[PDB]
Design a binder for this molecule. Structure first.
Ligand SMILES: [Mn+2]
Ligand SMILES: [Mn+2]
Ligand SMILES: [Mn+2]
Length: 391
């Protein structure tokens, strides 16, 4: 092995400017990091700058350095969609023709009609909403009628809420399984169906930890699958295990925040493993990008950057750190959807004594997957070109 451990960090939604095909998606002008930097009157990310973020692209407060710690370039998404699954699945060596859909105006009547026909239940709601908002509005009617509250987020999900005393958990799970079957259809391709049971009285409803998720497996065996099958460790941190529906995962560490994500990364640095530690920092996307909150997004990026020196200190000569993103989600852009953007790529090992250089632009996110596979001597993915030898 060239490297014994690879630490892969997806800064979720942290895009570095509109991709060549951004027009198709209505994403002309999109620039996640750049617009955040302008909002902040300069972003304070000195550690990402030291790695060479500014060498990829100069933005307000983010300048190039003469000697970046590691190698740098950006990646272009090759798959059709810009959704949560597509980006991650491509990173791990796939190509995804069929995008997952989002539903800013709610689900098509055809889909909801079939769900009603199959379940014998009425559906109410059918809108994007937080768990709290939707229960405040509809919790009581749901309790009184035995209907189903169906709602969505800004991502590709169909959520079904029902009071635990009115709809038994096992019946709610059965319904979600029906909904999962109906949404494997490119007319309304849903990434994840989520059971959202709740308890309480009107004006005091709370969602319970009896949530169950119904996700799709990646459309192909991934580099994670190949690592696991070759007896390597694959440690998933945050939503990673969920994103891949556990495929190729040997250990999964739940996280509650970006700072907690960095704590778990540090935990894995302290573990003797051989293979991949794979972190998703999701706050950027979930709390700030979708909510179009550039101030909060900027603060989160500064908080993340300040955690990096400890990571640098713990990396060994045979460790490789890869930092990237999965799509954009520009907090100063119309609507609530992701933006089609290039993503940054930083590749650092303390064994890089002369520092790094610019890499050729990665024509698919799958170049990460290919690099990981080549490093560990496992079957190469169908897509992606390794940059291992460039490091
Ligand atoms: Mn757009
Ligand atoms: Mn994402
Ligand atoms: Mn998202």
């Amino acid at each position: 092995n060239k490297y014994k451990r690879i630490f892969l960090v997806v800064m979720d939604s942290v895009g570095i400017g509109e991709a060549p095909d951004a027009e198709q998606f209505g994403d002309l002008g999109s620039d996640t990091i750049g617009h955040i930097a302008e909002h902040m009157n300069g972003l304070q990310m000195p550690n990402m700058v030291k790695l060479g973020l500014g060498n990829i692209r100069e933005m307000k407060g983010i300048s190039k350095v003469e000697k970046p710690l590691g190698y740098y370039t950006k990646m272009q998404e090759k798959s059709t969609g810009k959704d949560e699954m597509t980006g991650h699945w491509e990173i791990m060596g796939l190509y995804i023709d069929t995008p997952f859909q989002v539903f800013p105006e709610g689900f098509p009547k055809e889909l909801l009609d079939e769900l009603e026909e199959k379940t014998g239940r009425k559906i109410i709601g059918n809108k994007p909403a937080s768990g709290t908002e939707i229960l405040d509005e509809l919790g009581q009617e749901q309790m009184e009628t035995g209907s189903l509250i169906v709602y969505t987020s800004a991502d590709s999900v169909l959520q079904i809420a029902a009071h635990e005393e009115v709809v038994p958990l096992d019946e709610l799970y059965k319904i979600c399984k029906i909904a999962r079957e109906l949404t494997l259809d490119e007319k309304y391709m849903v990434g994840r169906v989520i059971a959202r049971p709740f308890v309480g009285e009107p004006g005091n409803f709370t969602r319970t930890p009896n949530r169950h998720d119904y996700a799709l497996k990646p459309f192909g065996r991934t580099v994670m699958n190949e690592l696991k099958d070759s007896d390597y460790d694959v440690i998933a941190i945050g939503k990673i295990s969920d994103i891949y529906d556990g495929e190729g995962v040997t250990e999964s560490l739940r996280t509650k925040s970006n700072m907690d994500g960095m704590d778990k990364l540090v935990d894995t640095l302290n573990m003797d493993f051989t293979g991949l530690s794979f972190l998703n920092l999701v706050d950027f996307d979930a709390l700030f990008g979708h909510r179009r909150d550039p101030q909060g997004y900027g603060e989160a990026l500064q908080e993340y950057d300040a955690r990096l020196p400890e990571v640098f200190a713990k990396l060994k000569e045979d460790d490789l750190l890869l930092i990237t993103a999965d799509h954009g989600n520009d907090p100063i852009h119309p609507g609530t959807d992701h933006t089609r953007e290039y993503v940054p790529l930083l590749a650092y090992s303390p064994s890089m004594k002369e520092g790094g250089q610019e890499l050729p632009l990665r024509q698919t996110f799958a170049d990460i997957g290919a690099t990981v596979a080549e490093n560990f001597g496992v079957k190469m993915p169908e897509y992606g070109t390794s940059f291992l030898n460039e490091l």
